[PDB]
Amino acid sequence: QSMSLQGKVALVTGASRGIGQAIALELGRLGAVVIGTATSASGAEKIAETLKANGVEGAGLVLDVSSDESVAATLEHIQQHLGQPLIVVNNAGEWFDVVNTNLNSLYRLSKAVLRGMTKARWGRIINIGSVVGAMGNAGQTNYAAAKAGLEGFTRALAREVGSRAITVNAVAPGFIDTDMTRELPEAQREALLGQIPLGRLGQAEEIAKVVGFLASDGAAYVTGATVPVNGGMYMS
Amino acid sequence: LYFQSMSLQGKVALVTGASRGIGQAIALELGRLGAVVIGTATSASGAEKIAETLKANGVEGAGLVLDVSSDESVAATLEHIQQHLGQPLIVVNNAGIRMKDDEWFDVVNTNLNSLYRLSKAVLRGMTKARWGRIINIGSVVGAMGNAGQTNYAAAKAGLEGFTRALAREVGSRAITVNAVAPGFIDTDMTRELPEAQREALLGQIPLGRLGQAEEIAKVVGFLASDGAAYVTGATVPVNGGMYMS
Amino acid sequence: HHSNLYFQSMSLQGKVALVTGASRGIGQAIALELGRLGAVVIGTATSASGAEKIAETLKANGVEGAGLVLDVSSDESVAATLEHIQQHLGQPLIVVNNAGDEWFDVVNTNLNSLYRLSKAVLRGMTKARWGRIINIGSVVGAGQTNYAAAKAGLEGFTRALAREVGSRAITVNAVAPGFIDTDMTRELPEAQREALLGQIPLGRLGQAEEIAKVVGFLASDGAAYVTGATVPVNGGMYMS
Amino acid sequence: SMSLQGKVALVTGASRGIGQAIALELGRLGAVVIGTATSASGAEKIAETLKANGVEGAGLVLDVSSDESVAATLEHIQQHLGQPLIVVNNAGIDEWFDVVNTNLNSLYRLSKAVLRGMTKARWGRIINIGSVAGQTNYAAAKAGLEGFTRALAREVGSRAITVNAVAPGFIDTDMTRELPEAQREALLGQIPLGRLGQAEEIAKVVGFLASDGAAYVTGATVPVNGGMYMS
Numbered sequence: 004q005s006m007s008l009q010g011k012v013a014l015v016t017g018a019s020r021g022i023g024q025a026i027a028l029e030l031g032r033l034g035a036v037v038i039g040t041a042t043s044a045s046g047a048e049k050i051a052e053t054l055k056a057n058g059v060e061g062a063g064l065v066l067d068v069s070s071d072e073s074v075a076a077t078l079e080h081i082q083q084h085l086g087q088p089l090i091v092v093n094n095a096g097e098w099f100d101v102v103n104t105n106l107n108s109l110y111r112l113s114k115a116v117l118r119g120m121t122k123a124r125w126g127r128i129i130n131i132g133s134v135v136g137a138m139g140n141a142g143q144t145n146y147a148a149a150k151a152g153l154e155g156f157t158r159a160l161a162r163e164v165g166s167r168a169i170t171v172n173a174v175a176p177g178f179i180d181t182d183m184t185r186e187l188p189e190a191q192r193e194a195l196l197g198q199i200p201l202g203r204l205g206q207a208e209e210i211a212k213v214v215g216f217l218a219s220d221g222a223a224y225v226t227g228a229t230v231p232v233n234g235g236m237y238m239s
Numbered sequence: 240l241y242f243q244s245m246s247l248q249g250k251v252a253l254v255t256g257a258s259r260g261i262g263q264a265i266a267l268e269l270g271r272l273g274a275v276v277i278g279t280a281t282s283a284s285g286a287e288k289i290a291e292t293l294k295a296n297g298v299e300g301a302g303l304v305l306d307v308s309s310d311e312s313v314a315a316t317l318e319h320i321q322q323h324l325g326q327p328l329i330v331v332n333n334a335g336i337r338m339k340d341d342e343w344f345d346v347v348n349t350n351l352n353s354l355y356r357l358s359k360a361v362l363r364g365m366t367k368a369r370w371g372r373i374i375n376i377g378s379v380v381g382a383m384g385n386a387g388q389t390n391y392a393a394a395k396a397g398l399e400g401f402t403r404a405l406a407r408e409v410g411s412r413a414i415t416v417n418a419v420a421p422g423f424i425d426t427d428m429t430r431e432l433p434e435a436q437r438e439a440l441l442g443q444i445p446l447g448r449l450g451q452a453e454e455i456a457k458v459v460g461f462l463a464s465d466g467a468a469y470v471t472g473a474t475v476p477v478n479g480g481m482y483m484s
Numbered sequence: 485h486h487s488n489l490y491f492q493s494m495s496l497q498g499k500v501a502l503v504t505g506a507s508r509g510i511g512q513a514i515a516l517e518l519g520r521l522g523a524v525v526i527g528t529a530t531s532a533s534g535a536e537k538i539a540e541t542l543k544a545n546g547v548e549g550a551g552l553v554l555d556v557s558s559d560e561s562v563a564a565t566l567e568h569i570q571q572h573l574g575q576p577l578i579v580v581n582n583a584g585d586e587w588f589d590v591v592n593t594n595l596n597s598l599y600r601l602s603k604a605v606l607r608g609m610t611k612a613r614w615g616r617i618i619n620i621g622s623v624v625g626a627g628q629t630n631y632a633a634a635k636a637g638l639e640g641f642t643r644a645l646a647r648e649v650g651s652r653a654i655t656v657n658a659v660a661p662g663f664i665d666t667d668m669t670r671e672l673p674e675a676q677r678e679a680l681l682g683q684i685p686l687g688r689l690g691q692a693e694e695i696a697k698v699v700g701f702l703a704s705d706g707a708a709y710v711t712g713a714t715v716p717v718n719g720g721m722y723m724s
Numbered sequence: 725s726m727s728l729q730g731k732v733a734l735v736t737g738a739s740r741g742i743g744q745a746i747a748l749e750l751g752r753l754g755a756v757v758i759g760t761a762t763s764a765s766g767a768e769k770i771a772e773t774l775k776a777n778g779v780e781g782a783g784l785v786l787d788v789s790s791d792e793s794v795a796a797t798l799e800h801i802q803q804h805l806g807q808p809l810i811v812v813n814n815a816g817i818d819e820w821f822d823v824v825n826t827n828l829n830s831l832y833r834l835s836k837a838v839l840r841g842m843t844k845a846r847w848g849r850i851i852n853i854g855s856v857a858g859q860t861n862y863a864a865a866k867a868g869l870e871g872f873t874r875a876l877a878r879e880v881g882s883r884a885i886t887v888n889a890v891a892p893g894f895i896d897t898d899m900t901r902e903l904p905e906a907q908r909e910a911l912l913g914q915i916p917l918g919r920l921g922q923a924e925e926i927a928k929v930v931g932f933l934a935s936d937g938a939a940y941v942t943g944a945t946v947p948v949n950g951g952m953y954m955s
């Protein structure tokens with residue numbers, strides 16, 4: 004009668020900063036045991052501090068989602084130590100190659116965690132889209148493309164794994180206040196505020212709450228869906 | 240002076256079409272989250288029933304008679320609420336008013352005129368408070384034929400473009416506007432068409448089951464929260480993986 | 485009410501086409517294109533001088549047809565107009581709707597007009613067991629809210645109507661123009677035009693004719709299996 | 725004014741069905757047409773069909789999954805018939821993912837290879853034909869085709885090159901002719917037009933998209949499905 008993720012293990016890729024960090028803390032707040040990942044040892048260490056610092060049981064690991072070996076080994080380490088990850092949030096990220104590489108990483112990781120979810124006959128996979136913030140024309144092409152790829156992928160994977168009570172969903176952030184976007188040139192940021200009906204940048208936490216909800220038992224009938232979290236700014 | 244993640248304490252919510260099924264489940268969910276809940280129906284016995292259900296589940300609120308097709312009804316109803324309980328800052332439109340692939344136009348036209356009516360009327364209150372949630376519930380799947388698809392696809396497309404457009408119009412005032420597009424939900428309609436044809440429905444749904452009314456309500460419950468503040472103009476499908484447009 | 489070279493393009497020979505809002509721009513271009521393809525063309529406008537002008541343009545480009553006064557918002561106008569056409573020129577089997585808190589009322593009013601007119605021409609197409617209905621969208625023109633909405637409305641409508649009339653071999657389609665060269669857009673300050681062109685991959689405004697060719701195609705027998713579709717004609721500029 | 729006289733068109737997977745119909749339609753419009761197939765007997769057949777319908781062109785062996793095949797094939801065309809400015813990708817190829825990933829890698833391979841020619845001529849048409857268990861794979865292939873087509877259109881647009889897709893519904897082809905009557909009729913029952921589409925009816929759309937009249941259409945995916953939409 005609640006959104007408690009007590010007893011569940013969650014894996015959040017790219018958790019050392021920004022959105023991923025905010026997602027790790029939110030799932031922690033909800034009672035999940037949280038494994039966050041980064042590509043470096045110091046990133047993984049930092050994830051661990053942040054967890055203790057906010058009273059979250061879990062760990063930081065080194066993970067490169069572009070390589071089969073890293074993925075296989077990492078998942079093994081988790082299984083042997085903390086249990087099977089039943090919540091998995093892919094947040095660790097020229098148009099063609101970017102999208103092709105991202106989606107190969109989603110599929111890789113998703114397929115690897117699926118054996119565990121299948122066995123438990125329950126699971127949540129949640130895919131975070133790229134943030135809006137794209138120095139140029141290139142960057143609109145790239146965001147629209149990444150979004151279309153995420154959506155069709157998420158929908159297709161949901162249909163494939165649905166019969167096992169595993170939901171698969173995506174979250175498509177708009178213009179979010181992050182360490183990356185605070186660095187954009189003022190003209191570019193203001194031109195983006197001018198496009199957003201809510202008249203402000205979204206917070207990382209505001210992405211994390213959606214992920215938090217999608218991970219809950221309450222969201223059990225939501226699958227193959229891509230939830231936009233963009234303040235009313237839609238770009239396609 | 241309180242503050243927690245999903246609370247709606249201190250907020251007044253208005254849920255149209257709350258006497259049964261989805262709307263009832265929504266009223267109880269917003270109640271469960273601490274909202275003062277006004278549910279509505281088109282009849283006195285419906286409104287009575289809403290009130291019983293609230294008290295019976297310990298929810299502070301009321302049942303009112305409301306016809307969303309009529310300006311007078313809407314104006315008067317909102318007045319009563321303002322006079323007595325305060326300003327409704329959460330508003331969930333769920334009162335949509337043998338069917339064939341030609342009835343689509345009128346159904347959708349009538350629904351959307353009612354959304355706009357009610358929405359515009361509650362907007363003055365939300366504007367004044369510089370905060371608000373409007374949530375629009377789509378039609379469930381009401382017939383499994385061609386007739387039934389045309390109508391569901393159409394109702395969905397209309398709801399989505401409407402919700403998006405309205406979100407853009409009111410966004411600058413910190414008012415989110417969202418929709419929920421239920422798929423095949425366990426309700427009065429779905430239960431009574433015998434199974435050999437109904438069971439064929441489960442085969443179209445990857446989750447392999449009908450959705451529960453509660454499962455729509457949790458989504459509405461989330462969208463109404465402060466956590467969902469950056470979600471606007473969105474239509475959340477809640478269909479077990481069955482997508483049709 | 486104002487009314488031997490065999491060109492090869494003349495594939496809509498023998499068909500009567502009705503193009504609403506034909507006195508200028510896109511609608512005018514559509515009337516001449518369907519004319520070019522051999523259709524007998526009735527174009528419409530809301531005023532007598534508009535209808536006069538349509539007729540001049542037709543004769544001036546050697547198109548058999550007429551200019552009529554039509555108000556698509558009124559049942560009487562529609563019924564009477566269609567009857568005049570039936571009694572004089574035959575049954576219109578190709579029909580192109582191009583004649584158009586603001587955000588809601590615009591879309592609601594348009595779609596009520598589409599449905600009115602569409603339902604009225606449908607008896608004729610049903611009897612002939614063939615027909616083309618083509619709906620021209622809102623061009624670009626606060627303007628962002630309205631364009632996405634108008635588009636979503638047009639598209640769901642077009643799709644739903646296609647499903648309803650399909651069994652009778654009547655296609656129903658829409659065309660969603662992007663930024664089209666019209667007499668208003670030619671007058672922007674260079675900075676404004678260049679900034680708009682910078683959003684369009686083709687790097688130019690579309691021509692009215694370029695909308696008309698799509699309509700021309702959709703009207704043909706070749707497009708018989710295309711129905712409930714909305715064809716964007718925007719130079720690669722997609723707004724949501 | 726639908727003419728393609730003087731233009732060279734390349735149609736992959738042209739030995740039968742849709743691709744064949746596309747090759748004859750672009751031929752009918754005056755294009756010099758190179759059709760392709762994966763086998764020698766397929767390529768021969770393409771050539772017979774062209775001569776048999778008075779179309780100037782050729783049948784070539786092409787495997788769009790291989791860089792070498794593509795590079796060599798395009799060279800042969802450049803050296804013999806000129807630069808292909810109209811290009812229609814119709815040769816299609818845990819199963820959903822790989823299908824779509826492989827198809828889109830083939831589109832991108834071929835597209836990039838023909839793009840040099842179009843850039844040089846400052847004009848071009850690229851048209852991608854979609855696929856004709858089964859919903860997951862169709863919805864996925866479609867979503868991939870659409871986003872791809874749109875993204876590529878944005879990239880090459882400034883050079884007066886349109887890039888578009890055609891998403892056929894249920895078409896009368898060698899696959900569909902094999903279904904049991906109850907199953908096909910249940911499929912007709914989902915199609916408002918009440919019939920299967922013809923290959924020619926896909927081809928006319930391609931024919932139109934290739935024309936100068938369609939110059940302002942780019943990044944678009946035209947459904948050709950008799951009113952049956954599955955997503």
Ligand SMILES: Nc1nc(-c2ccccc2)cn1NC(=O)Nc1ccccc1F
Nearest residue numbers: 103148152155156824825864868871872
């Ligand atoms: N390799 C690749 N490129 C793209 C793509 C590029 C631009 C826009 C949209 C998709 C998508 N993908 N996607 C895939 O590999 N798989 C994929 C794409 C869409 C739906 C389902 C899929 F599996």
Ligand SMILES: Nc1nc(-c2ccccc2)cn1NC(=O)Nc1ccccc1F
Nearest residue numbers: 348393396397400401591592637640641
């Ligand atoms: N009369 C009508 N029909 C439809 C419609 C029909 C089929 C699919 C989608 C919308 C919508 N509407 N009415 C509206 O007032 N507005 C409207 C429709 C679609 C999107 C946005 C809108 F404001």
